[PDB]
Amino acid sequence: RIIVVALYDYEAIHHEDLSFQKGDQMVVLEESGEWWKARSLATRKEGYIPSNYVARVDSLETEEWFFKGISRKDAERQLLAPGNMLGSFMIRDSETTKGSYSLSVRDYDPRQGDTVKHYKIRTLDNGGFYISPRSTFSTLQELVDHYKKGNDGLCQKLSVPCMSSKPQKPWEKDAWEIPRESLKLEKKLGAGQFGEVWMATYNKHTKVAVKTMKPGSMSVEAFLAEANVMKTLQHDKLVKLHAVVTKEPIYIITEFMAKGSLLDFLKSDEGSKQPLPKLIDFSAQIAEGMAFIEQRNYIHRDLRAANILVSASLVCKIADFGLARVIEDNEYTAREGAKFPIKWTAPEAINFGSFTIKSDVWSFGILLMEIVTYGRIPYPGMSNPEVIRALERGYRMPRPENCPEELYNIMMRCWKNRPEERPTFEYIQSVLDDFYTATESQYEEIP
Numbered sequence: 001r002i003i004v005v006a007l008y009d010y011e012a013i014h015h016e017d018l019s020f021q022k023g024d025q026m027v028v029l030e031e032s033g034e035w036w037k038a039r040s041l042a043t044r045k046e047g048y049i050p051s052n053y054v055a056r057v058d059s060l061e062t063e064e065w066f067f068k069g070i071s072r073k074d075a076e077r078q079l080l081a082p083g084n085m086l087g088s089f090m091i092r093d094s095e096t097t098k099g100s101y102s103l104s105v106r107d108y109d110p111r112q113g114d115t116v117k118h119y120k121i122r123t124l125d126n127g128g129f130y131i132s133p134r135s136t137f138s139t140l141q142e143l144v145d146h147y148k149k150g151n152d153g154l155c156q157k158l159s160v161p162c163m164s165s166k167p168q169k170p171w172e173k174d175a176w177e178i179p180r181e182s183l184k185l186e187k188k189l190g191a192g193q194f195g196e197v198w199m200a201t202y203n204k205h206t207k208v209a210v211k212t213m214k215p216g217s218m219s220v221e222a223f224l225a226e227a228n229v230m231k232t233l234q235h236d237k238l239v240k241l242h243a244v245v246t247k248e249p250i251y252i253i254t255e256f257m258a259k260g261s262l263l264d265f266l267k268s269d270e271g272s273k274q275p276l277p278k279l280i281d282f283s284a285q286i287a288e289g290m291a292f293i294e295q296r297n298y299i300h301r302d303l304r305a306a307n308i309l310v311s312a313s314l315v316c317k318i319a320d321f322g323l324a325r326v327i328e329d330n331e332y333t334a335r336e337g338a339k340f341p342i343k344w345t346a347p348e349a350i351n352f353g354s355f356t357i358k359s360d361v362w363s364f365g366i367l368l369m370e371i372v373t374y375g376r377i378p379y380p381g382m383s384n385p386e387v388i389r390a391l392e393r394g395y396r397m398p399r400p401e402n403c404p405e406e407l408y409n410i411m412m413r414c415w416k417n418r419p420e421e422r423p424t425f426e427y428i429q430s431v432l433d434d435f436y437t438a439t440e441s442q443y444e445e446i447p
């Protein structure tokens with residue numbers, strides 16, 4: 001008997017699902033995947049439900065100011081998003097203290113601009129919580145109501161909970177390999193060497209993107225084996241693979257990303273106006289994605305701004321991870337020109353076909369330069385043979401205008417000729433995540 005309460009408004013997309021009145025009471029049965037079967041209270045008939053729309057009644061997951069799952073870094077991004085105000089806040093699980101909590105509050109000063117301050121919410125041994133010992137509370141709800149009435153030592157008085165959008169409905173049960181007929185291709189987004197990309201509708205109810213691979217470009221079995229690894233690479237900064245059509249021409253089905261590639265974005269009216277701290281935040285988002293790929297012993301093989309996608313809310317998501325591996329070299333793909341771009345590719349990958357996480361690190365440094373130049377071609381003024389020979393003699397792209405020296409230093413580290421000398425994405429992540437907050441403490445010590 002596990003009791004669970006609803007949270008959002010959702011009607012059955014399928015024919016087996018129930019209703020959500022933004023408030024209800026349910027009791028879960030089986031807990032496989034992201035769809036759960038639950039015994040509900042309207043009234044004595046049930047079915048399957050999306051797990052991300054519900055929560056246990058005991059935990060704080062029901063509270064509007066609590067954000068389960070998210071990181072410190074993501075708390076900051078969420079809060080600094082447009083639509084939030086001074087003293088906007090959230091409570092989340094602590095990162096550096098298991099079982100305890102953290103308060104994140106949107107702040108402002110003329111000297112540092114918009115910032116997010118973090119406070120340790122310590123738990124008392126016999127029940128209750130405090131930030132400062134002189135002010136303890138039975139519940140986190142009491143803590144919140146307290147600091148809503150006055151800052152009492154915090155940077156700001158709490159105003160309203162961090163805004164949040166209703167999450168993506170989880171993908172249909174056991175719909176990994178789907179029929180081609182289940183997709184309606186509505187708008188061609190782009191045409192490339194080995195396939196096209198379409199905006200499309202799945203089963204007349206869900207917006208997706210579909211990459212349609214050219215006949216001759218991939219083998220069904222080799223692709224499916226690889227895709228079965230790709231789908232498990234689940235992370236906020238990787239684009240999500242929903243499903244595949246396992247019949248030539250092979251279709252790849254993913255979440256749709258409203259702002260297209262980061263390269264397109266940086267070259268748009270809107271993206272060309274992003275300020276440098278936002279550019280650095282894109283870099284950090286990609287580094288986080290790559291550190292996950294690195295921790296999972298996977299290889300991207302074609303990391304560049306063109307293969308980064310951008311959401312409506314400016315989340316960067318890595319796409320085409322691993323795809324280059326299963327694009328075949330034959331008479332068909334050959335008449336399409338270069339398989340990989342020389343200017344983005346590590347020298348050992350070019351010279352010997354040695355693709356590793358370390359050649360991805362090389363590509364990342366190039367991507368960094370693409371970002372800070374808003375999508376300029378690498379090595380301007382140079383041919384491909386000229387780039388290769390210059391690189392062999394220690395030439396590296398010089399630092400451009402409007403590039404912080406520490407960002408350049410990171411690029412130069414990525415561009416070591418010997419791969420073992422290049423940093424880890426775990427390192428790159430940490431430096432970029434803390435780029436502007438290096439000489440600052442994690443949490444504020446409130447008297």
Ligand SMILES: CC(C)C[C@H](N[C@H]1CC[C@H](n2cc(-c3ccc(Oc4ccccc4)cc3)c3c(N)ncnc32)CC1)C(N)=O
Pocket residue numbers: 189190191197209210211230239241252254255256257258259260261264309318319320321322323
């Ligand atoms: C200005 C532009 C109109 C020009 C155009 N730009 C193009 C830039 C990329 C655009 N694109 C590509 C994908 C995508 C990427 C990989 C996928 O598959 C995989 C495979 C393996 C792993 C992960 C995803 C699936 C979808 C995609 C998406 N999901 N949502 C929105 N736009 C997308 C398409 C236009 C161009 N001509 O370049």
